Design a protein around this ligand. Structure first.
Ligand SMILES: Nc1ncnc2c1ncn2[C@@H]1O[C@H](COP(=O)(O)O)[C@@H](O)[C@H]1O
Ligand SMILES: Nc1ncnc2c1ncn2[C@@H]1O[C@H](COP(=O)(O)O)[C@@H](O)[C@H]1O
Ligand SMILES: [Cl-]
Lengths: 317, 309
């Protein structure tokens, strides 16, 4: 019956125990928990993100946007001096329900002032070991991953070389006509690399190409890559971490470029001036990470979809 | 500058300690924590509530409503066997920001199978004493509060009698609306001064989620807690009968120049399947934290209120 929960009672008890462990993990490291809004008068500019919008009575209401990630408010807190902070929030992305996506989901996001990407990866690995009781993670660069799995260099290979690889994977249909080099790299990573990682233990992939920087600063030593990592385990994308952007002008260029592209494609998005204002005042150098709690719980239970770990997925909420 | 949080660093650190204290309270009592949706294909019919609505792409699109409280999903869990459970969630009500309101706010809602209203009140009192280091609560009925502060009986006074009383307070054709004005203006400023005040047995018309008292049909098994001028919690002996719940929703819609809301069948269906006898309570965590901090507004304990979020 559609009235019943999506997840079993035993799975929801284990869910609460994991949430408690996560909280003990950060308590033990002196990391403060914060709560930030689920709604903003501003939204994100990323072309790949689709925000929920709702009207607030505010005689003239205010448009509000549900938060795809608590990043901007947490950076505002950091700029104001909160120190190392974590949050376990409900996040909202207007995406269809899938085995591994729900339009509302639990995010674990945290920030560590004065931590570089490597020190943060190590902390994420310790958390995985604790919750999953899994082995210590392996780490490799995006480059190394391609070289080991596909015998190509993704930082230097031309599109012909790229389609040669795609052909070997039985992917020529999609690859032959695709003329965007980075898009071909994503096809190859998804189809040629992802199936061969995260098997025995979690796998960190870091130094994604500059085009796939997302929230990451570009690597100063090699502008071809970004200070971003992603963790994979048993075929599941669990987390993305970054050496965060502290430069206001650089951040603003990102948003403006985003809205310029959206126009070329999508509505232009109300920029978070509050975030740019925080960066102008001064955000401590930091690395931050966003982890999918529902996926973590799914893996900890050996469950096969989010419907097993979320009380009511959107189809019956 | 607008970029800065509403709440100070010290207040947020104290807020987190309180969150963890609430969790310790329930852990010590073996109550399970759950998480239920912030969004639903269904909504509420309650005449006092204004939800947010937002459009979902779907598996074409679907209208979603944000949750005003986790009640309906927690009842579904209860009907499925979850046992005593609490939740600390963000709840959503489409109403302007005020000193004591934000359109998104933290709710502590919990449910106790086999607790009556009195046993639940006692448990609320214990939590308040823990968080606030306040004195044990006093309790009185809606009737007693009107008798002690206004010298009238709200259960039997006629409208003339009521207007006379409103006249004496230096202040409408509905008797219940009259009672509401009297309570807000004549009773509320005069309770919760030195310790939390539990008001119980609200009139039948103000039943909200509560069963009617079987022993006196003029009143409901509902209580409200007030402290230092502020409304902190609402608790009920819960409705378990599907037929009665549905008639209440039908009536809700009748009373609604407000839009008519659909009745949530999943809730009714859970009630049909069987909801254990239980009492539940909804508490305003931000309000509670504000009182713990001796602060004046929610802007002092919420990292970013809506005006700057
Ligand atoms: N719709 C969704 N449902 C469940 N988990 C998600 C969803 N979107 C993102 N995630 C998780 O959140 C993490 C952070 O995503 P991002 O903020 O896009 O880097 C991802 O690695 C996923 O584990
Ligand atoms: N907009 C709001 N902002 C902050 N607290 C609220 C808001 N609406 C309701 N509350 C709190 O939530 C409690 C339970 O709500 P209710 O069940 O509607 O009485 C109330 O007693 C208030 O403490
Ligand atoms: Cl107890």
């Amino acid at each position: 019956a559609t009235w019943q929960p999506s997840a079993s009672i035993p799975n929801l008890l284990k869910r609460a125990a994991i949430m408690a462990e996560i909280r003990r993990f950060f308590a033990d490291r002196g990391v403060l928990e914060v709560e930030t809004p689920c709604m903003s008068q501003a939204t994100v500019t990323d072309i790949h993100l689709f925000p929920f919008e709702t009207r607030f009575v505010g005689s003239q209401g205010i448009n509000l946007y549900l938060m795809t990630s608590p990043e901007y408010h947490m950076k505002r807190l950091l700029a104001a001096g909160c120190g190392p902070v974590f949050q376990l929030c409900r996040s909202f992305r207007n995406e269809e329900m899938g085995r591994h996506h729900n339009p509302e989901f639990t995010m674990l996001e945290w920030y560590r002032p004065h931590y570089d990407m490597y020190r943060l990866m190590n902390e994420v690995d310790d958390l995985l070991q604790q919750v999953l009781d899994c082995q210590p993670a392996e780490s490799l660069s995006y480059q190394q991953a391609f070289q080991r799995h596909l015998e190509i260099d993704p930082l230097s290979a031309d599109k012909t070389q790229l389609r040669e690889a795609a052909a070997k994977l039985d992917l020529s249909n999609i690859a032959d006509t695709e003329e965007d080099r980075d898009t071909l790299l994503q096809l190859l990573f998804t189809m040629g690399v992802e199936p061969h990682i995260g098997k025995e233990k979690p796998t960190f992939i870091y130094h994604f190409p500059a085009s796939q920087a997302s929230l990451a600063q570009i690597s100063t030593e090699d502008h071809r890559v970004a200070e971003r990592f992603e963790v994979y385990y048993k075929g599941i994308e669990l987390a993305n971490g970054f050496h965060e952007l502290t430069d206001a002008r650089e951040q603003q260029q990102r948003f403006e470029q985003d809205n310029r592209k959206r126009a070329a494609r999508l509505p232009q998005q109300p920029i978070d001036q509050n975030l740019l204002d925080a960066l102008a005042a001064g955000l401590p150098d930091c690395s931050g990470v966003a982890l999918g709690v529902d996926r973590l719980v799914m893996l900890a239970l050996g469950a096969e979809s989010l419907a097993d770990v979320i009380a009511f997925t959107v189809d019956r909420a």
